[PDB]
Amino acid sequence: SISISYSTTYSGWTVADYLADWSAYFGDVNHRPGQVVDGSNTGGFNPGPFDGSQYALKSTASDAAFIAGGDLHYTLFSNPSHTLWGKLDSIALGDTLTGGASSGGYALDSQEVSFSNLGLDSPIAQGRDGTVHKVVYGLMSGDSSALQGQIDALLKAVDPSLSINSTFDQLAAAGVAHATPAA
Ligand code: HEM
């Protein structure tokens, strides 16, 4: 089942409100045709260059950032083009990225909320219609709707009364979330 970690700073917030707020600060990195010419809006994989246990990206509008974790693969120019697929186990949201390929992998200087044990697996055959692709590309483009929908489905799988409209504290009372220090 899904496992959620959240800073106590967000206790009485619902999952939906947090994601809408984080997405508002992250914005859209404009990772679209003809607009990706360098590493300013590509993000990066660990180990990379196009496959890894982590994909991380910082906003070009603020210092908001996220890290997707699992067994991820990006097709780039091969068919189906520009598709992220594979297994997505976690999404960590926060502020300011650190790491790369030295002391280890990627991390967030301030990790606000994370969703783990997602259990998502999208085969390459699904192309951009796969859930993994929609979830991550949505985050890159300022539309966390796909992530919100998947989290909602995973919470309802635990109990039909849970939802992204539930406060993080209610999810902790349900045994699905765990509060971490204000900082
Ligand atoms: C190493 C990281 C990445 C690099 C170097 C990269 C590079 C590129 C480039 C150069 C383009 C432009 C293509 C063009 O002008 O025709 C592009 C487009 C695109 N990329 Fe990436 N990308 C990366 C990661 C990702 C990830 C993780 C996703 C999905 C979650 C993604 C989704 C897309 C999509 C949907 C397009 C639009 C293609 C279209 O509309 O035809 N990219 N990418």
Buried b / exposed e over 38-61, threshold 16 CB at 10 Å, is eeebebbbbeeeeebbbbbbbbee
Q: Probe ligand 1: pick from 57, 71, 74, max atoms within 8 Å of CB?
A: 74
Closest CA to 16 of 151, 177, 179: 151
Residues making up the binding site for heme: 31, 74
CA-CA distance, 34 to 152, in Å (whole number)?
34
Tokens of 139: 């985050």
The answer to whether the peptide bond before residue 80 is cis (omega within 30 degrees of 0) is: yes
CA-CA distance, 3 to 135, in Å (whole number)?
17
**What is the Rg, in whole angstroms, of the alpha carbon atoms belonging to the chain?**
16
For residue 24, what are the CA distances in angstroms to 17, 18, 141?
10, 10, 11
Q: Probe ligand 1: pick from 26, 36, 133, 137, max atoms within 8 Å of CB?
A: 36
Experimental method: X-ray
Q: What is the resolution of this structure in A?
A: 1.7
Would you give the distance in Å from CA 66 to the centre of its chain?
6
By residue range, what is the domain housing residue 57?
A: 1-183
- What does the longest C-alpha to C-alpha distance in the chain come to? 47
CATH number at residue 142: 3.30.1500.10
Kindly give the number of the ligand 1 atom that is closest to the alpha carbon of 45. Answer: 1
Structural domains in the chain (count): 1
Kindly give the number of the ligand 1 atom that is closest to the alpha carbon of 135. Answer: 30
- Report the run of H or E that residue 22 belongs to, with start and end: helix 15-26
Residue type, 73: H
Strand-pair category, 44-47 with 51-58: antiparallel
Distance of CA 158 from the midpoint of ligand 1 (Å): 34
Strand-pair category, 51-58 with 64-74: antiparallel
Taking residue 170's Cβ as centre, other Cβ atoms within 10 Å add up to: 17
Tokens of 167: 């406060």
- How many Cα atoms occupy the beta-carbon half-sphere of 14 within 13 Å? 12
